[PDB]
Amino acid sequence: VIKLHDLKPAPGEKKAKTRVGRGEGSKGKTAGRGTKGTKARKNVPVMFEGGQMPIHMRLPKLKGFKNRFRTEYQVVNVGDINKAFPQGGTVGVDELVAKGLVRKNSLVKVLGDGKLTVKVDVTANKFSGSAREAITAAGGSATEL
Amino acid sequence: PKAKTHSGASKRFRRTGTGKIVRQKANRRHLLEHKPTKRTRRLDGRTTVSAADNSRINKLLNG
Amino acid sequence: TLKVDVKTPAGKTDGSVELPAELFDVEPNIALMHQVVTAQLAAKRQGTHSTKTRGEVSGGGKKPYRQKGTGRARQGSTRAPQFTGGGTVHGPKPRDYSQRTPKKMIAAALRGALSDRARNDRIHAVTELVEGQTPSTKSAKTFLGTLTENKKVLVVIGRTDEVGAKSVRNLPGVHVISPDQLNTYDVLNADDVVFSVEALNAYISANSK
Amino acid sequence: ARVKRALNAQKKRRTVLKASKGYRGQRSRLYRKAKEQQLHSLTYAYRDRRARKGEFRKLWISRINAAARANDITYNRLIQGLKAAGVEVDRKNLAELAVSDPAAFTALVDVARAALPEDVNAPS
RNA sequence: CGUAGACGGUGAGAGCCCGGUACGUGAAAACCCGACGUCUGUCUUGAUGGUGUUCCCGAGUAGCAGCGGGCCCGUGGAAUCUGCUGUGAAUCUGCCGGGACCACCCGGUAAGCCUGAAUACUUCCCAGUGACCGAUAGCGGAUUAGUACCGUGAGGGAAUGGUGAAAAGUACCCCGGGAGGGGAGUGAAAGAGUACCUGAAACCGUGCGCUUACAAUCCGUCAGAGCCCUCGACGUGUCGUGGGGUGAUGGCGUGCCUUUUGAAGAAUGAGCCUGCGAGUCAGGGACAUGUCGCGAGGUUAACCCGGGUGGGGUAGCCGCAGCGAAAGCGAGUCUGAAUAGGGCGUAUCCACACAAGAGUGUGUGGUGUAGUGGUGUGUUCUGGACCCGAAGCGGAGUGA
RNA sequence: AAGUCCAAGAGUGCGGCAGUGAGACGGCGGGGGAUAAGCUCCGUGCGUCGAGAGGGAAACAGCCCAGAUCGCCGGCUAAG
RNA sequence: GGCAGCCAACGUGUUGGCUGGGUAGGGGAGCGUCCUGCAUCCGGUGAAGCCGCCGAGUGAUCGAGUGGUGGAGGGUGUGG
Known part of the structure; x- marks a missing residue:
């Protein structure tokens, strides 16, 4: 039987903490910090660059705005529609979420990246031109709702 | 305490699909008269941040 | 199919229970069990261990003496760490060692x-621990002896069997747990696991569901 | 988990003081001052283990040369002659013969003189 | 024996000797929490539902400015909320709020109120807990403790535990004035004597062995006579695969740490010993790696139920499709009147072709892309952030 | 094109972690100085010290020989 | 003659070739402390501690080897 005295960690799972500042044999004295300086007693911040204009100030701010109202779609490709539904059939947002192709509460859009070979009655907030075309070509229907 | 993101870096750098950090070039805001359009185009758009600054830019963007 | 015979206290097997392979035939993962039991014991550990830093120890607000001229080391407080009676530099502070181990793990x-x-x-499975009504440690010990000669025994008993709980409670190497609280550390610590039939059925139902 | 630095601390102290048993003054009594002398003690031990070979070879050479002069031959010509004769007796055992068995050393001196070139100073 | 094997005590590891424990029982009184009646109010002095037309629907108010405060919002295009100053409206075709204004449209009827629960804390009391401290620790305080002591004052602010199971703590001898001791006794132990468990080092003796008063010594190291002990042998006192002490003499030999180009350095620190004294911890933090779990999925936070780890918890988070500044489009997308090229993406890789040798492309066909939760470790973020150290700054007080 | 190639423990790229960013002297090429400084500032797939013990320069970081894994009371040599 | 790092060969870990000065620093593997899960073992027939003796390890260090004092808790394994 296995026991609490038989339980061990996995090989290489646990590593010995590095005891810095304990004798010269290990990381001793300066404790891996070297001799005098700022870094011998403090951590210099990430944004400081010696006093010259930092890279986060001498470079221009990226152009544009974020458009608070942007409507973004969780996308599923028709190749994934094929893989998830070899039998075809009705494929709504609920079906896609069940098969784990889109987030549960989101605006679903369908894109034609893979290839479609089965009759699918897909129903998503929007369809790319290629996705609609493939859905129709496979004998299915793409009801945008 | 959540690690706060550097606002300046967040506003001046971006990641692509693969994860490359991109930035716009300096020297395109003003004093554009004497700049030949070839220089202005060279400065136009985004380029990957140099490998040297990639580390600190990534640290500022993550936290 | 693992058919555990249900032995009654009287010494008569009353049916058998089938232990599902998904629950009682899994390949034992030593590293997984180790992480889980270590998380359990860390959760059990209350980090009620504190020390006063140099700002928490009493007094020491005033600079003990002049900065220069006294021929003595520069001290900024009689409560600095080097001082006898001063504060602990990196001593313990209360900690919550519990670990958020994933449910599947x-x-x-x-x-x-x-x-x-x-x-x-x-x-092992059993219809009852003693007989019902009045607890009897002697009877429960006799029955657990007839079942298993090992020392550590985990009795997974239902919440309603207060009789059996009390009867087996006072045996030295016999932990008592409920089927919903069944945990790694308990099962691994116990040499044998004795289920009341109801407890076994409850565990199997709750897990196969 | 407060650990006292006593069980562990005294082990190296007892070791260093036991090693320093025999030193003069503080170097045998105080752990800190014994440790300073123990560093030098083992530095010297290493240096002198490595220089003992050379200094014993020096002693052997001195004694072999003494016996060579007694036998009316120079030490370097004795070594040259022994090499020419193919006598692979090292200086340790040569000096042992010089001291214990001078007749054997005289025999080896005769061998080396015999194996020396007719003219040692000739270019050859 | 056990519905009691919790914990402690007892002359040393006690379920069974003791206090107790499991489990049972016990309030005269007082207090609290419940109900049960008097009692208190109200409704019944009534309930129903439909029509059309005047007054009412909180005023120094809302609103507007001038200056401010607050909000992510630092005055900004600055809404909403607010203080002080003025100016100051209408009552439903009213008025606000939708971050200024509308056929607008929605939210509805402010300028007067009271409102439990969910929530924060523990001076105090009770019962417990500790991979907390264990007398330089842990509270400053295991003892006298905020005491002694210091300061005029505010204020600062200590040190000091352990005989033994039981005091059995040396009735009466001796030396001494006493202290203290030697007897003798108690004690298992006095190698426990109220100076008391253990009794380290520093430090101070005494005894013994070697060695040193012709010698220039970082105090050692290597050779090493002599001397003094030990283990064997042979069984002569001398040799040994020996061991230990000392060290005549010879060789070599410039402390440790720090900080430096460089220190034995006549640069820093250290008189000595013992004890303590410095990369720690929190966070679904960030990055990277290890390792488990599950895997195109992975996890759940709060919270709920479990006298425990355990079970629930699908809100969210990260994956999952990119390009762009969005109408956005989407394995494409942005740029461009310009199918002109580039940017970034389409994991990766293999074969087929078409091409061009401008560094290789284009499609087509194959396998199908791997994250994400714990957790270890190293860095890191916010915190005191590895530890010590200023002069000084501020708030409130104390001092003529 | 070979060599080195059971290695230089090489070069390159991407990541984790750094430390360093006070150098010294010597040879050679130079600036400043007085073609002084143990001066100062450069270059040097130059060296050594730094961070390097050992031998030689008497002693003597930087000069010459030579790069200490340990033990031998073995041998041959380097500079000298 | 011993040890250690890389590498190869074949094996089921032996050999061989190279390589093992080192400060800042990086990586790897460990000794020791006490606190604990579990498992075992020692202890008033004398634990720890301390003082030695005789030794042991490539290091930190070790003696479930021993003697003196001692008087009650300790060791080992494996994890946290």
Whole structure:
């Protein structure tokens, strides 16, 4: 039987903490910090660059705005529609979420990246031109709702 | 305490699909008269941040 | 199919229970079980261990003496760490050692421990612990002796069997747990696991569901 | 988990003081001052283990040369002659013969003189 | 024996000797929490539902400015909320709020109120807990403790535990004035004597062995006579695969740490010993790696139920499709009147072709892309952030 | 094109972690100085010290020989 | 003659070739402390501690080898 005295960690799972500042044999004295300086007693911040204009100030701010109202779609490709539904059939947002192709509460859009070979009655907030075309070509229907 | 993101870096750098950090070039805001359009185009758009600054830019963007 | 015979206190097998392979036939993962039990014991550990830093120890607000001229080391407080009676630099502070181990990891560790026991034939089932009504440690000890000669025994008993709980409670190496609280550390610590039929059925139902 | 630095601390102290048993003054009594002398003690031990070979070879050479002069031959011509004769007796055992068995050393001196070139100073 | 194997005590590890424990029982009184009646109010002095037309629907108010405060919002295009100053409206075709204004449209009827629960804390009391401290620790305080002591004052602010199971703590001898001791006794032990468990080092003796008063010594190291002990042998006192002490003499030999180009350095620190004294911890933090779990999925936070780890918890988070500044489009997308090229993406890789040798492309066909939760470790973020150290700054007080 | 190639423990790229960013002297090429400085500032797939013990320069970081894994009371040599 | 790092060969870990000065620093593997899960073992027939003796390890260090004092808790394994 296995026991609490038989339980061990996995090989290489646990590593010995590095005891810095304990004798010269290990990381001793300066404790891996070297001799005098700022870094011998403090951590210099990430944004400081010696006093010259930092890279986060001498470079221009990226152009544009974020458009608070942007409507973004969780996308599923028709190749994934094929893989998830070899039998075809009705494929709504609920079906896609069940098969784990889109987030549960989101605006679903369908894109034609893979290839479609089965009759699918897909129903998503929007369809790319290629996705609609493939859905129709496979004998299915793409009801945008 | 959540690690706060550097606002300046967040506003001046971006990641692509693969994860490359991109930035716009300096020297395109003003004093554009004497700049030949070839220089202005060279400065136009985004380029990957140099490998040297990639580390600190990534640290500022993550936290 | 692991058919654990249900032995009554009287010494008569009353049916058998089938232990599902998914619950009592899992390949025991030692590293998983170790992480799970270590998380359990860390959760058990209350980090009620504190020390006063140099700002928490009493007094020491004033600079003990002049900065220069006294021929003595520069001290900024009689409560600095080097001072006898001063504050601890990096001493313990209260800590919450509990670890958020994933639910699947916890469940797999438990299923692995039960699987190990079932494989070794260390899982027994019973209709009752003593007889009912009045607890009897002598009767319960006699029955657990007739079942298993090992020392550590985990009695997974239902919440309603207060009789059996009390009867087996006072035996030295006999932990008592409920089927919903069945955990790695308990099963692994116990040499044998004795289920009341109701407890076994409840565990199997709750898990196969 | 407060650990006292006593069980562990005294082990190296007892070791260093036991090693320093025999030193003069503080170097045998105080762990800190014994440790300073123990560093030098083992530095010297290493240096002198490595220089003992050379200094014993020096002693052997001195004694072999003494016996060579007694036998009316120079030490370097003795070594040259022994090499020419193919006598692979090292200086340790040569000096042992010089001291214990001078007749054997005279025999080896005769061998080396015999194996020396007719003219040692000739270019050859 | 056990519905009691909790914990402690007892002359040393006690379920069974003791206090207790499981489990049972016990309030005269007082207090609290419940109900049960008097009692208190109200409704019944009534309930129903439909029509059309005047007054009412909180005023120094809302609103507007001038200056401010607050909000992510630092005055900004600055809404909403607010203080002080003025100016100051209408009552439903009213008025606000939708971050200024509308056929607008929605939210509805402010300028007067009271409102439990969910929530924060523990001076105090009770019962417990500790991979907390264990007398330089842990509270400053195991003892006298905020005491002694210091300061005029505010204020600062200590040190000091352990005989033994039981005091059995040396009735009466001796030396001494006493202290203290030697007897003798108690004690298992006095190698426990109220100076008391253990009794380290520093430090101070005494005894013994070697060695040193012709010698220039970082105090050692290597050779090493002599001397003094030990283990064997042979069984002569001398040799040994020996061991230990000392060290005549010879060789070599410039402390440790720090900080430096460089220190034995006549640069820093250290008189000595013992004890303590410095990369720690929190966070679904960030990055990277290890390792488990599950895997195109992975996890759940709060919270709920469990006298425990355990079970629930699908809100969210990260994956999952990119390009762009969005109408956005989407394995494409942005740029461009310009199918002109580039940017970034389409994991990766293999074969087929078409091409061009401008560094290789284009499609087509194959396998199908790997994250994400714990957790270890190293860095890191916010915190005191590895530890010590200023002069000084601020708030409130104390002092003529 | 070979060599080195059971290695230089090489070069390159991407990541984790750094330390360093006070150098010294010597040879050679130079600036400043007085073609002084143990001066100062450069270059040097130059060296050594730094961070390097050992031997030689008497002693003597930087000069010459030579790069200490340990033990031998073995041998041959380097500079000298 | 011993040890250690890389590499190869074949094996089921032996050999061989190279390589093992080192400060800042990086990586790897460990000794020791006490606190604990579990498992075992020692202890008033004398634990720890301390003082030695005789030794042991490539290091930190070790003696479930021993003697003196001692008087009650300790060791080992494996994890946290």
